[PDB]
């Protein structure tokens, strides 16, 4: 059952990068992130969505690579309409 | 980092 927490742990480059790739999202997209890390981290359940503030400092790795793993796929596939 | 200045105002806008 440690697969799960066998996930490599987001490097510093890399997390900078996540916000990044995160914040290439549209609104809705970032809507996912926000609904990952809040129930992952039930440190910052009182962020509503709409208002949200997510500490990448704060965040668990299986979050973070929850979180990667995710937008990659929505930035993989189509988003990229400015270059 | 990513407070509410880089998230909240590339997700709310």
């Given at each position: ?43 910052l359940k009182n962020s509503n969505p ?29 988003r990229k309409p400015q270059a | 980092k ?12």
């Amino acid at each position: 059952s440690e697969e799960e927490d066998k996930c490599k742990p987001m490097s510093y480059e890399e997390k900078r990068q996540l916000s990044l790739d995160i914040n290439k999202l549209p609104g809705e997209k970032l809507g996912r992130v926000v609904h990952i890390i809040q129930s992952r981290e039930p440190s910052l359940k009182n962020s509503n969505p709409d208002e949200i503030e997510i500490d990448f400092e704060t965040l668990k790795p299986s979050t973070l690579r929850e979180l990667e793993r995710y937008v990659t796929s929505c930035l993989r596939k189509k988003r990229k309409p400015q270059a | 980092k990513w407070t509410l200045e880089r998230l909240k105002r590339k997700y709310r806008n």
